[PDB]
Design a protein around this ligand. Sequence first.
Ligand code: HEM
Lengths: 189, 403
Amino acid sequence: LAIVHLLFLHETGSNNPTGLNSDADKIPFHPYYTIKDILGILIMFLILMTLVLFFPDMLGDPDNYMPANPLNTPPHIKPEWYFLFAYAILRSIPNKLGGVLALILSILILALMPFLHTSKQRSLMFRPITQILYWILVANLLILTWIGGQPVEHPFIIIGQLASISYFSIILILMPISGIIEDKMLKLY
Amino acid sequence: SVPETQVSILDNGLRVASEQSSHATCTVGVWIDAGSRYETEKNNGAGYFLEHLAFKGTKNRPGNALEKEVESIGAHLNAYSTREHTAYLIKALSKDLPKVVELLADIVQNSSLEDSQIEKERDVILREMQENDASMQNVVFDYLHATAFQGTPLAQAVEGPSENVRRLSRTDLTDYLNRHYKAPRMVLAAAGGVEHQQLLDLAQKHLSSVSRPCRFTGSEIRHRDDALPLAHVAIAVEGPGWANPDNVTLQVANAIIGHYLCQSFQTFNISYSDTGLLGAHFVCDAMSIDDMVFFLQGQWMRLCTSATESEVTRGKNILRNALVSHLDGTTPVCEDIGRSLLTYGRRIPLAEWESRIQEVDAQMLRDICSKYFYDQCPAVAGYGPIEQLPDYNRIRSGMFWLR
Ligand code: HEM
């Protein structure tokens, strides 16, 4: 699927942070973005080996070092941290089914994302209001990651419920309206 | 038994050389060690504009009456300017040898620059430059000189920028004339049916009045204009200079390279005073651009690594057959003579050239080619649809082999 991912991209070429047509300024990849990928590989290996050789259990759970007891239940059940945002959403919706669906949508909302683009500019380099909304989205994604960790009790629950409401409202509603407003400010709309 | 070029410098410093031949027609010229390299960016077109003004009349021969004289004997009058040398030459009969010399004397001294003419020649020069851009290979070689000799007086063109052309005055010209036309920097060269003693007496009679850190830079300059049908690309490295004998070996290598892919391949070894540009200027379609390069770079590395005796023998024969450059014709020889005395300080005979050619073998050719081509930073000048022309890392990586 990653090979198919690379194919569906070379047909169009990569994007640039300005979001403009970069056909006038393109360079080879071997000497310019290869040594850059090698440097990024080296930095990622530095972070991976300082995660392995120095703090090998800062991201895992201690209770996984006990054998599986079907009779004994743990006092607090978590998935690993990268599932937390989803975990929060699931817990937030009162209805079980609702939670499952919202959870799925949490990931799927992204797929839905290319149909929500209502701006005449591709990138957010020249779009400050949608930049603010994007960083608020990153902020409450971090909040949902924290909440998942917190146990079920006040006021963690309410935050979870709001954070999920704010997440879906920023992705679904606030960004296209903001893009319309930004197009109106540049005398385009 | 090559006819020797007898030379007779004057006390003023005017070297007077001549070589006699059967031809009853003789070519006489004056060479001056003055070009765009001696200009200081405030008079960047002084030599070119003086080269335009030099045939428009003198003090003794005012206006077109002067050129009426060179029509009267049926002689031909030519002049040219490079970055280092300026030449004023006449092709005439032998029996018209005195007056021609006298004519040349006026052209170098006693010349008259008319203010009226200055405006007319400014419009000529300006317009020509305004249309000179048409000649691509000239644009590409000027771009190569600029990007290879940035910050030096060797980057600036012979014609100069339109700016200076418009902003030039008699006095400035007078200066360039009075500064770079010294007698010790002048050679009176004659080739063909001339006697050396008669030419020396004529130089004593007239012309006896004449008054008595170069750096290469590797850089990618790219003039992209996609509306042009063809692309011209020149790639060069630093040359040794005039006085370095391995030039001869490099000439053989240039010969061996010859021209094999996209059309319009070529090779040059341009030499200036202890510097130069050694390289190739191909011209081609959008796609061939890269390969040709790739092609071209491979040939250079082959000459650095895998030179055989047969191609060296072929290049030596091509170079010798190129001594025809000397030939016997009055003009070419005279020209050759002109440079010899300005650059080497002497006329190198063809027997010495043949000795320096026959001492060249394959081992010293690949040694000298590795000295001048292998792992060197080139100067690249492109003009036209040059998007597929590779940038500097790919060319620099093609300047060596991993094997
Ligand atoms: C399996 C995990 C993934 C891998 C290893 C991966 C790898 C890559 C690589 C190597 C590129 C080209 C270089 C670059 O990253 O800028 C790329 C481009 C891209 N990927 Fe992914 N990708 C992954 C998942 C995703 C997902 C899930 C999406 C959609 C949400 C996505 C969307 C894109 C887009 C849009 C580009 C073009 C980016 C641009 O040029 O602006 N990829 N991917």
